[PDB]
Design a protein around this ligand. Sequence first.
Ligand SMILES: *[C@@H]1O[C@H](CO)[C@@H](O[C@@H]2O[C@H](CO)[C@@H](O)[C@H](O)[C@H]2NC(C)=O)[C@H](O)[C@H]1NC(C)=O
Ligand SMILES: *[C@@H]1O[C@H](CO)[C@@H](O[C@@H]2O[C@H](CO)[C@@H](O)[C@H](O)[C@H]2NC(C)=O)[C@H](O)[C@H]1NC(C)=O
Ligand SMILES: *[C@@H]1O[C@H](CO)[C@@H](O[C@@H]2O[C@H](CO)[C@@H](O)[C@H](O)[C@H]2NC(C)=O)[C@H](O)[C@H]1NC(C)=O
Ligand SMILES: *[C@@H]1O[C@H](CO)[C@@H](O[C@@H]2O[C@H](CO)[C@@H](O)[C@H](O)[C@H]2NC(C)=O)[C@H](O)[C@H]1NC(C)=O
Ligand code: NAG
Ligand code: NAG
Lengths: 49, 145, 24, 262, 124
Amino acid sequence: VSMTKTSVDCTMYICGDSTECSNLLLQYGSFCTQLNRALTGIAVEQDKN
Amino acid sequence: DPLSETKCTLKSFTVEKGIYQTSNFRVQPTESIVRFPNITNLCPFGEVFNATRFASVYAWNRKRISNCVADYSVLYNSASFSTFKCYGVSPTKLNDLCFTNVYADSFVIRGDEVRQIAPGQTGKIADYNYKLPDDFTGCVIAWNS
Amino acid sequence: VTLQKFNGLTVLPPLLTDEMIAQY
Amino acid sequence: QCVNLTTRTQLPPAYTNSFTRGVYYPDKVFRSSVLHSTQDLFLPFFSNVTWFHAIKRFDNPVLPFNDGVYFASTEKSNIIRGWIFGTTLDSKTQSLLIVNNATNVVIKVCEFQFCNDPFLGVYHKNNKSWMESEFRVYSSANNCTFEYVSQPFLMDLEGKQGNFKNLREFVFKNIDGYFKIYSKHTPINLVRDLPQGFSALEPLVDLPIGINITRFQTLLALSSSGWTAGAAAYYVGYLQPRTFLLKYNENGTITDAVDCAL
Amino acid sequence: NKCVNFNFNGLTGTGVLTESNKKFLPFQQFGRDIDDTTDAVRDPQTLEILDITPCSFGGVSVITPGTNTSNQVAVLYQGVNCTEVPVANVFQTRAGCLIGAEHVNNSYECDIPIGAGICASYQT
Ligand SMILES: *[C@@H]1O[C@H](CO)[C@@H](O[C@@H]2O[C@H](CO)[C@@H](O)[C@H](O)[C@H]2NC(C)=O)[C@H](O)[C@H]1NC(C)=O
Ligand SMILES: *[C@@H]1O[C@H](CO)[C@@H](O[C@@H]2O[C@H](CO)[C@@H](O)[C@H](O)[C@H]2NC(C)=O)[C@H](O)[C@H]1NC(C)=O
Ligand SMILES: *[C@@H]1O[C@H](CO)[C@@H](O[C@@H]2O[C@H](CO)[C@@H](O)[C@H](O)[C@H]2NC(C)=O)[C@H](O)[C@H]1NC(C)=O
Ligand SMILES: *[C@@H]1O[C@H](CO)[C@@H](O[C@@H]2O[C@H](CO)[C@@H](O)[C@H](O)[C@H]2NC(C)=O)[C@H](O)[C@H]1NC(C)=O
Ligand SMILES: *[C@@H]1O[C@H](CO)[C@@H](O)[C@H](O)[C@H]1NC(C)=O
Ligand SMILES: *[C@@H]1O[C@H](CO)[C@@H](O)[C@H](O)[C@H]1NC(C)=O
């Protein structure tokens, strides 16, 4: 009926605690927020189910 | 404030009713701690110097140092020695550095002839009984005795 | 049935607890 | 002080099976009630392993070392008393001594001129006594690098009777220059073969020795020739690079293992 | 019991360090879980185990009655406990900590969802 709700700080998975990763990962665009939309989506879907 | 943050985050001055994901909170690493094992086995500079009697420079010593801590906290810290000098590692760094292979070079000389030891030098000590190589990087210590 | 980390991951709680599903 | 004590029977190179001995803690890492895997050098399971004796007979050839070794011995009378390791084994380079004379475990690393076949001589006389007597190891040791003595003890050299009661197992690796010995000590009551069961060797000693090792020989306790040996078997097997899956228990001991090509 | 960065024997990490009931064998120094992530270390001077937890973090969510209703809001910090949030009308929940909403004993229907059986609503 449901699966475990998961969430990711995409910057923390990719290379959190490092500033040069904040400088570099910004060059890629919304390829974190798209995941945060996709997963916050899955999570509200489980309580719908 | 959280209302202006969500307004901004949603690209929308009307935030409609809801709950919205924003600005991940993370308590910062509030300091850095460093923990290493006790620096217990000090290398025996008190045998190298604090020993009764040294030998003459044509018979220059080579006492082995290995498997110990190169702690200069009663060495480059001290005023008691007339000369301390280094030749490619900064003298502050001798507590920071690791060596592969270390040997003491002990002897006695005339006070003028203290200047004969430096790699790239002349005078009779620096020719007939002693010399150091052009790629040496260690340190010399000498004192009025 | 047999079952907050360094890697940015977390697990969120469901809106209905296992008590609330027992009630339903 | 070295002599060629050739008063011995000649025997063929015997073989036996090695079931699942020779596992060890591969890194300094704690893990518990979990199954975890590494590709690493280990003794292969169920493999034919080489076998040797002191008995009349005293079996000790200078054997290759390649990528690491498992050594084990089923003992009485404390007759197995160390090893000699190294690439030349005759002063043309450094080599490694690891010995147990009755007062200390001792490790030394020098440009050693070893004997043709080193050993340790002991008194055996019927005025019942068992002290050290001759130390026939190397003549000369000019350029030395690594030197040690264990905190001083006394150990029995005594000719004590019976079947084998002590097992001591060892594994040996040189990685990047850092030489590692892992080992286990365990009780036995076995006549002629390696014990069916499991063990996981603890890391005893680790040293930044930097030498090359290419051939080992063992060091044993012993009118020049023509003398009494104690009875003891010892075994040798090579490590081979192979994947293992390992089980750690709640205490983090390797409790059983599997070899992924068995 | 502080969020610190650390280096132990060259092993570098971050988290809340604390006293451990675990027992490593005399030759292990760092613990690793199923995930192969470093959960504990032996201190190299007291020779006792520290458990380590990556220090408090999570999403934040802003709870909001609509702009055309009000300019009032509440903040949920997710998994973060109320003892760790003030660095950024307090109620602590199995969802974490919520700030800016009155806890009230009246069980209505879910006007805004929060998690673990909690919802919020805007009213008189
Ligand atoms: C075991 O071998 C060691 C190594 O040669 C012996 O230790 C040396 O003994 C002499 C005499 O006591 C000392 O001068 C040396 O300083 C010792 N070596 C070191 C590094 O300290 C030891 O005596 C031997 N044991 C027996 C029973 O002969
Ligand atoms: C090891 O000891 C030997 C013994 O002296 C040293 O050999 C000498 O080395 C120099 C430089 O290569 C030669 O000119 C001499 O002819 C060598 N003589 C002998 C007797 O070997 C060797 O240098 C030493 N090695 C180390 C690393 O200390
Ligand atoms: C883990 O190691 C401990 C210590 O060897 C074992 O616990 C002991 O168990 C016996 C038998 O019940 C008790 O008499 C001891 O008092 C216990 N000691 C301690 C320190 O707890 C335990 O059995 C081992 N784990 C497993 C799976 O065997
Ligand atoms: C490093 O030094 C400290 C103290 O200088 C050692 O801590 C002592 O340990 C003993 C035994 O547990 C205690 O009785 C003492 O109270 C401790 N000292 C203090 C000041 O409390 C520590 O053991 C040393 N570390 C190593 C690895 O030897
Ligand atoms: C939205 O805003 C206008 C002006 O405040 C108001 O007339 C309208 O009724 C509001 N809509 C709702 C649904 O409250
Ligand atoms: C709500 O009810 C609980 C008991 O279930 C009580 O602890 C609490 O004080 C009550 N609060 C109010 C505001 O009445």
